[PDB]
Design a protein around this ligand. Structure first.
Ligand SMILES: O=C(O)C(=O)C[C@@H](O)C(=O)O
Ligand SMILES: [Mn+2]
Length: 428
């Protein structure tokens, strides 16, 4: 790569030093060197480019945005000087865009990418990156137009294909998204071996009733994107017993389970009263997971935080749960009532973390028609009885009964997490 043009080429003899004072790892040296060559040879592009790469690394070191924000401008400075090597120009603005994205300046990074495409209107790689810039600001229509131009010129570019598929899927063109994601992934091209595209390919296939989704999930597993073909959560802790269904005894949380089973009519009655008196406290569940039907939830604890207005409506239930911080303190979980009406189907999905187990207490369960699957096992609820599964494993639900189904959902920390783990895990 030709980063040295005439104007600089003369004074390369000293350039090598500064860059190796970096490679050496003596960043302090490298910075001051390049800064000194900045004043000795203002005009030099490589001189600038060096000061910026120094600042970039000195920021990773100190972990200082303020620092990195300095580099982002110096990368811009490389691109103001004259007869700047196009290799070096591409390099510097590519890095600025990346660093802009790192800090959250998505539109700023888009502007940089827009500039690079104007400078280099035949670099496909840069158009691909521009489309990401558009995605990162939510402008999928302009991202769609970019990947269409690329595909018009390079019809087998896997990076554009998988991104085109994503955009199609997000425009509710689900069946059309699938071959784009399949072919992009199978191209093996750089940037296509990303767990997000396996996730979307399998979701799309499931949603059009294509059993081949699990092949791709298994391939995702083999490629490191998923714990297994069934357990596909994103935010995981290693070393936690992984099984879809659990018994109370297996969890150790036997006193919690007893308190829920033994006081279940109280728990029921408070929820039914909120249904009757404050029905708008039950909020509609995830529209994305809802194929059809009527499905709503009344949350008492969100990520370790008590909802106080909720507990004024379910006072005795909240008071009961206070005794069990394995759930009230589960920052990766929830505690919520959940009502599902006839004609409801919940798409197969997993939750976000393997750090919780999900308990379901049955409160109002019609005698036929309600069922939940987790992995290969399909079960049903019972009034006053708790079911426990690991919702990081794919689960799916159906409500084909003649009246409403009410359950009570209680997340607990995975029982193998140690107290210090429970204490230090970020919430989600
Ligand atoms: O508990 C979950 O994680 C579910 O996906 C289903 C649940 O919300 C329900 O009402 O049946
Ligand atoms: Mn779920």
């Amino acid at each position: 790569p030709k980063l040295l043009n005439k104007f600089d080429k003369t004074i390369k003899a000293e350039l090598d030093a500064a860059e190796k004072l970096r490679k050496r790892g003596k960043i302090e040296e490298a910075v001051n060197a390049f800064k000194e060559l900045v004043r000795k040879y203002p005009q030099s592009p490589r001189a600038r480019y060096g000061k910026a790469q120094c600042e970039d690394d000195l920021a990773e070191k100190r972990r200082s945005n303020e620092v990195l924000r300095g580099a982002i401008e110096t990368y811009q400075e490389v691109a103001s000087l004259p007869d700047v090597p196009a290799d070096l120009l591409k390099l510097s603005l590519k890095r600025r865009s990346d660093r802009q994205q790192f800090l959250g300046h998505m539109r700023g990074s888009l502007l940089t990418l827009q500039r690079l495409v104007q400078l280099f209107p035949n670099d496909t790689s840069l158009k691909n990156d521009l489309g990401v810039g558009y995605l990162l600001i939510g402008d999928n229509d302009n991202a769609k137009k970019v990947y269409e131009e690329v595909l018009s010129v390079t019809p087998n570019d896997g990076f554009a294909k998988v991104h085109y598929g994503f955009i199609l899927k997000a425009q509710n063109k689900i069946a059309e998204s699938i071959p784009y994601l399949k072919e992009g992934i199978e191209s093996g091209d750089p940037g296509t071996d990303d767990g997000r595209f396996y996730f979307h390919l399998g979701d799309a296939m499931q949603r059009v009733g294509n059993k081949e989704a699990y092949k791709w999930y298994e391939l995702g597993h083999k490629r490191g994107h998923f714990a297994s073909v069934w357990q596909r959560s994103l935010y995981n802790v290693n070393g936690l017993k992984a099984q879809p269904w659990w018994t109370p005894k297996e969890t150790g949380y036997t006193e919690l389970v007893k308190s829920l089973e033994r006081n279940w009519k109280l728990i029921r009655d408070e929820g039914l009263a909120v249904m009757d008196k404050a029905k708008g406290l039950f909020l509609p569940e995830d529209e994305n997971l809802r194929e059809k039907g009527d499905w709503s939830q009344f949350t008492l604890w969100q990520q370790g935080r008590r909802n106080e207005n909720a507990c004024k409506g379910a006072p005795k239930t909240c008071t009961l749960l206070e005794k069990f911080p394995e759930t009230t303190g589960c920052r990766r979980g929830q505690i919520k009532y959940s009502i599902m009406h006839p004609g409801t189907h919940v798409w197969p999905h997993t939750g976000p973390t393997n750090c919780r187990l999900r308990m379901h207490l049955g409160l109002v369960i019609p005698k036929e028609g309600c069922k939940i699957r987790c992995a290969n096992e399909t079960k049903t609820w019972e009034e006053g009885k708790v079911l426990i599964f690991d919702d990081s494993f794919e689960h799916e639900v159906w409500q084909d009964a003649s009246s409403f189904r009410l359950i009570f959902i209680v997340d607990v920390w995975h029982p193998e997490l140690t107290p210090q783990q429970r204490r230090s895990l970020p919430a989600i």
